[PDB]
């Protein structure tokens, strides 16, 4: 029983931002939570594109790449969605993927902006984030140019591809006054103070703490739009707990095997 007893203080919560503070935990725990923010939080993003027609100036793999990076609202759906690899379906089904379609032809003499508003899903929950600011521009079409495609968006996390990363910016820091001397400033007076610095203006560093350890960690998790910023953190804690649970199950099997 050597577990930490960490506390949470939410200092800011908007639709694209959670600034919170985790106290009384370890630096490894804080960094693993920060890494799971980027790499191990599953969202829904386009991963299968067939293109029936592409008369645009951008080639087909270009359009597929731009479709994969469009975020889709994965709230309360990616939890009840299976992985395609773990699904028993032959090709695709609502249990593991969301179907998107696009059919835009430009018949007018001005440029047609094929945006993420033109992405039509059969699931009313999983839609492009800008369709729920302008829309994410996929391609521009001249007159006589057409883009007709069918896509499937599956579930995955940022460890596989960056299009499944739910976060824009995970600001993470600790010990804002350099009390632990984890970084050593050659000229401490040359360095600007952070947002969380508790020093007056004449000071440049805290006095050195010989017995101190990293015990308070400041996060600013910014969401790209797929999940709410608090949903990213909750799913990250759940995913890290699930990874440790599966590792403990395999460890119990390995121990009882010997």
């Amino acid at each position: 029983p050597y577990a930490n007893q960490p506390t949470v203080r939410i200092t800011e919560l908007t639709d694209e931002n959670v600034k919170f503070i985790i106290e009384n935990t370890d630096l490894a725990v804080a960094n693993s939570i920060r890494r799971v923010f980027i790499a191990e939080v599953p969202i829904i993003a386009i991963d299968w594109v067939q293109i029936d027609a592409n008369s645009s100036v951008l080639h087909d793999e270009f359009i597929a790449h731009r479709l994969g990076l469009i975020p889709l609202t994965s709230d309360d759906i990616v939890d009840k969605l299976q992985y395609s690899r773990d699904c028993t379906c032959e090709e695709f089904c609502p249990e593991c993927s969301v179907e998107f379609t696009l059919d835009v032809r430009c018949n007018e003499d001005q440029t047609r902006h094929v945006t993420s508003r033109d992405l039509i899903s059969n699931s009313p929950r999983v839609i492009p984030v800008t369709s729920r600011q302008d829309d994410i521009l996929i391609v521009k079409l001249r007159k006589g140019q057409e883009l007709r495609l069918r896509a499937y968006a599956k579930k995955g996390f940022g460890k596989e591809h960056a299009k499944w990363n739910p976060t824009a910016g995970v600001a993470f820091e600790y010990d804002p006054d350099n009390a632990l001397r984890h970084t050593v400033y050659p000229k401490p007076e040359e360095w600007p103070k952070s947002e969380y610095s508790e020093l007056d203006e004449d000071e440049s560093q805290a006095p050195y703490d010989p017995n101190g350890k990293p015990e308070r960690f400041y996060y600013n998790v910014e969401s790209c739009g797929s999940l709410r910023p608090e949903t990213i953190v909750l799913s990250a804690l759940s995913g890290l707990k699930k990874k440790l649970s599966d590792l403990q199950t395999q460890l119990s099997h390995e121990i009882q095997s010997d």
């Binding site: 991963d47 067939q50 395609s84 690899r85 699904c87 032959e90 090709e91 695709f92």
Partner: protein
């Protein structure tokens, strides 16, 4: 072989959903040249369905 030259879809395993063309096929495994990447994978034919 009757599978060589036929377009094919991987239906099981970690390549599920990928579309390819069978360059070389045996009774057990088939070389599927993938449309989506720059590689030719080797996958068993029980994970393959013909489009």
């Amino acid at each position: 072989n009757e599978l060589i030259g036929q377009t094919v879809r991987i239906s099981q395993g970690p390549y599920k959903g990928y579309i390819g063309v069978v360059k070389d096929a045996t009774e057990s495994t088939a070389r599927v040249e993938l449309h989506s990447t720059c590689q030719t994978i080797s996958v068993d034919r029980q994970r393959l369905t013909t489009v």
